[PDB]
C-alpha cells in the first residue's frame, strides 16, 4: 500500500496473508468469507507469463495477522489448503478479466477478536454503494512505493467514474472490473501495490453497519502514479460463480 497508514489492531479481521512455504515469502493478500473459505485474486496463483502456477501444497494461509514478518504466537492461525478454484474464464492472456479464486481450507478456523469473516454484497447493497465518489478501504502488507511495512497498511480510496478509468489506460476494461483512486487534481494520494494483490476492497454499509467486500485488488500500472488508477475485481458481478462453487464443493 502506497500513502497509507498503519492499521489498528483488529481493524480488518478478514484480512488473510497468502504465504509461500519455500522460499518462505509473502505472495498476496486474501479475505476470509466464512470459517473455511478464502477469497483471493486468480493471478496470485496462476500467471503463465511469469511462470507462476501454485498448487494447494505450495501455500499456507495465515489468518489474524498484524505484523508482516513476525510469527504472532497465540494470535494468528495458520491453515493448509484442501482445494483451489480458479474462475474458468479468468483471462490471464489479455487483461486479467475475472481475476478471482476461491480456496477451501483443510479445517474450519475458529473466530476470535482478530479473525472474523467479511460479508459478500447482495444485489441491493452493490447497487447502492458502488458509485463514483464513494470511498472504500484497501489493506495489505504490499510494497510502500513503486520499502516493505512492518505492520498491515490501510488506505481509503474513492470509486472512480467508468469513463475516467477507461481513458487512463490502453488495457481493455470489462464490466467485471472497477477502478479507484484520487484524480491528479484532488491533492490526496494512495494506491495498492505489488504484494497487495488478492486483498479486499471493503465498504461499510450505512444501512446495517456491516462491512461488505466489494472488490479484489487486481491490477494497475505502477503504483500511485498520477493519472492512473487501481483496478479491482467486481465481486458482485461474479457472485453467481462464487455461490456455485461453495454449495457444490
Amino acid at each position: 500500500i502506497v500513502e497509507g497508514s498503519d492499521a489498528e489492531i483488529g481493524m480488518s479481521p478478514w484480512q488473510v496473508m497468502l504465504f509461500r512455504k519455500s522460499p518462505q515469502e509473502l505472495l498476496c493478500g486474501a479475505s476470509l468469507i466464512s470459517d473455511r473459505w478464502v477469497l483471493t485474486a486468480a493471478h496470485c496463483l496462476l500467471y503463465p507469463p511469469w511462470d507462476k502456477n501454485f498448487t494447494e501444497n505450495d501455500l499456507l494461509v495465515r489468518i489474524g495477522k498484524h505484523s508482516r514478518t513476525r510469527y504472532e504466537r497465540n494470535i494468528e492461525k495458520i491453515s493448509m489448503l484442501e482445494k483451489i478454484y480458479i474462475h474458468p474464464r479468468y483471462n490471464w492472456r489479455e487483461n486479467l478479466d475475472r481475476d478471482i479464486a476461491l480456496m477451501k481450507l483443510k479445517k474450519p478456523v475458529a473466530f476470535s477478536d482478530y479473525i472474523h469473516p467479511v460479508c459478500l454484497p447482495d444485489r441491493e447493497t452493490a447497487a447502492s454503494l458502488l458509485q463514483a465518489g464513494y470511498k472504500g478501504r484497501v489493506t495489505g502488507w504490499g510494497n510502500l512505493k513503486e520499502g516493505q511495512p512492518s505492520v498491515l497498511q490501510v488506505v481509503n480510496l474513492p470509486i472512480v467514474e467508468r469513463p475516467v478509468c477507461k481513458d487512463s489506460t490502453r488495457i481493455r476494461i470489462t464490466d467485471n472490473m472497477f477502478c479507484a483512486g484520487y484524480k491528479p487534481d484532488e491533492g490526496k494520494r494512495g494506491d495498492a501495490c505489488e504484494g497487495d494483490s488478492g486483498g479486499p476492497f471493503v465498504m461499510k454499509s450505512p444501512f446495517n453497519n456491516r462491512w461488505y467486500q466489494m472488490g479484489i485488488v487486481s491490477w494497475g500500472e505502477g503504483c500511485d502514479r498520477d493519472g492512473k488508477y487501481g483496478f479491482y475485481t467486481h465481486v458482485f458481478r461474479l457472485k453467481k460463480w462464487i455461490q456455485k462453487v461453495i454449495d457444490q464443493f
Binding site: 489492531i9 483488529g10 468469507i33 456491516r210
Partner: peptide
C-alpha cells in the same frame, strides 16, 4: 450470519480512526 461486524469495533460500538471518512462520502 455475523459477517462484517468486528469484535473490537462494531460489537463494542467503538469506531476506528478513519471509518467516518467512508460514511461521509456516501
Amino acid at each position: 450470519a455475523d459477517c462484517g461486524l468486528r469484535p473490537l469495533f462494531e460489537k463494542k460500538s467503538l469506531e476506528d480512526k478513519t471509518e467516518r471518512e467512508l460514511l461521509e462520502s456516501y
